[PDB]
């Protein structure tokens, strides 16, 4: 079966270097080329070029030229992507293609999110947040959890270990000086709260921080 | 496969150098009605060596 993986999530800073790989599998390497397709952090996709793999000759996009690569390793059927003197503006997700030629590809790659940032790994802020008066509309009481400046990502917020997910939406996070902010809020009704408990379980164990906040009426 | 390929023997390159022209002589086109002649003519009188 056909099916190309890459490096995964990748924590980068500016003025650094990396090379991106990209393995692939059920076929032999060197009969297809690896288009190489960046998105942008506007959800743009912008199309950085195709290494002719045999020969293994890199074709680059003129706009991505000279500060990228694109190499290759024929044994184990990696295809990599190099990257020299790494920019903020690159921070974004990276992918490669099994080439059909003039047709493209009938495969996308697993996909490469490169983050090019200058911060400290941080446990995040989990606030528990009371809701007040007017936070209280038709028989439910919203509950909410405040999750502000955590590196890096991912966190997995829950509710009570999980247990409710009903009105539970988990927001993302964006950038404030390099750390992250999100929120997650819980619907529950006027009858849940404060009789029974609601805590929000942040997970971050990329700061290894699992916190538990319970919300208290005021 | 030691510069730049995984092919031997052959390749391609274009090699661009912009111009740059440090002197130039320049031609001239006479037209004919554009042609003095200036004729000195003379006749001899009583003269000095002035």
């Known amino acids: 079966q056909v099916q190309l993986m890459e490096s995964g999530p990748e924590l980068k800073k500016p003025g650094e270097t990396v090379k991106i790989s990209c393995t692939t599998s059920g076929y032999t390497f060197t009969d297809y080329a690896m288009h190489w397709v960046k998105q942008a952090p506007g959800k743009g996709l912008e199309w950085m070029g195709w290494i002719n793999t045999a020969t293994g000759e890199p074709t680059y996009a003129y706009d991505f030229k000279e500060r990228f690569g694109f190499s290759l390793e024929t044994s184990a059927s990696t295809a990599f992507l190099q990257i020299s003197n790494l920019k903020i503006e690159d921070t974004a997700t990276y992918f490669c293609?099994?080439?059909?030629?003039?047709?493209?590809?009938?495969?996308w790659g697993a996909g490469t999110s490169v983050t090019v940032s200058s911060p400290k790994t941080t446990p995040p802020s989990v606030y528990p947040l009371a809701p007040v008066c007017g936070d209280t509309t038709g028989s439910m009481v919203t509950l909410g959890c405040l999750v502000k400046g955590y590196f890096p990502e991912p966190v997995t917020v829950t509710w009570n270990s999980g247990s409710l997910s009903s009105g539970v939406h988990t927001f993302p996070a964006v950038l404030q000086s390099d750390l992250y902010t999100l929120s997650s809020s819980v619907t529950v009704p006027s009858s849940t709260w404060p009789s029974e408990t609601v805590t929000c379980n942040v997970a971050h164990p990329a700061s290894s921080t699992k916190v538990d906040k319970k919300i208290v009426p005021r | 496969w030691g510069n730049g390929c995984g092919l031997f023997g052959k390749g391609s390159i274009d090699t661009c150098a912009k111009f740059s022209c440090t002197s130039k002589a320049i031609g001239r086109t006479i037209q004919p009605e554009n042609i003095k002649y200036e004729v000195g003519i003379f006749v001899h009188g009583t003269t000095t060596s002035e």
């Open positions: 293609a099994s080439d059909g030629r003039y047709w493209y590809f009938g495969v």
